[PDB]
Design an enzyme around this catalytic site. Sequence first.
Site, PDB file in Angstrom:
ATOM      1  N   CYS A 193       0.833  -1.209   0.000  1.00 23.91           N
ATOM      2  CA  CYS A 193       0.000   0.000   0.000  1.00 23.91           C
ATOM      3  C   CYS A 193       0.901   1.308   0.000  1.00 23.91           C
ATOM      4  CB  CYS A 193      -0.908  -0.073   1.217  1.00 23.91           C
ATOM      5  SG  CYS A 193      -1.825   1.469   1.494  1.00 23.91           S
ATOM      6  N   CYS A 215       0.377   3.932   2.754  1.00 24.59           N
ATOM      7  CA  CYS A 215       0.837   3.582   4.117  1.00 24.59           C
ATOM      8  C   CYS A 215       2.273   3.951   4.317  1.00 24.59           C
ATOM      9  CB  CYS A 215       0.812   2.077   4.290  1.00 24.59           C
ATOM     10  SG  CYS A 215      -0.801   1.406   4.489  1.00 24.59           S
TER      11      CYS A 215
END
Length: 105
Positions: free
Chosen positions: A32, A35
Amino acid sequence: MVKQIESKTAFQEALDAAGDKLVVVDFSATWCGPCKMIKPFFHSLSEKYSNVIFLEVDVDDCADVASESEVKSMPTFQFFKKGQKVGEFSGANKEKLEATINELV
């Protein structure tokens, strides 16, 4: 510092150990992009807000916590006080992350 959570038991123990302090949990995945962008910032908040507890759950390494917490996007930030969930939102939104800390602490 950001404490890495590796098991269900470890999460619960962290929530218990927190006493009355706000606990902020970053649910993250390696895959991700957002993130990873927000990790240095999350870590910076952990130094700034010394009386808040900061935890990180990697959703794939710690898949049973991810399932129980009902994560579907990353990052998700959950907030706890006295073992109870008092907030949650998703997305790598720094402003909102820090604002939510200030609202709940």
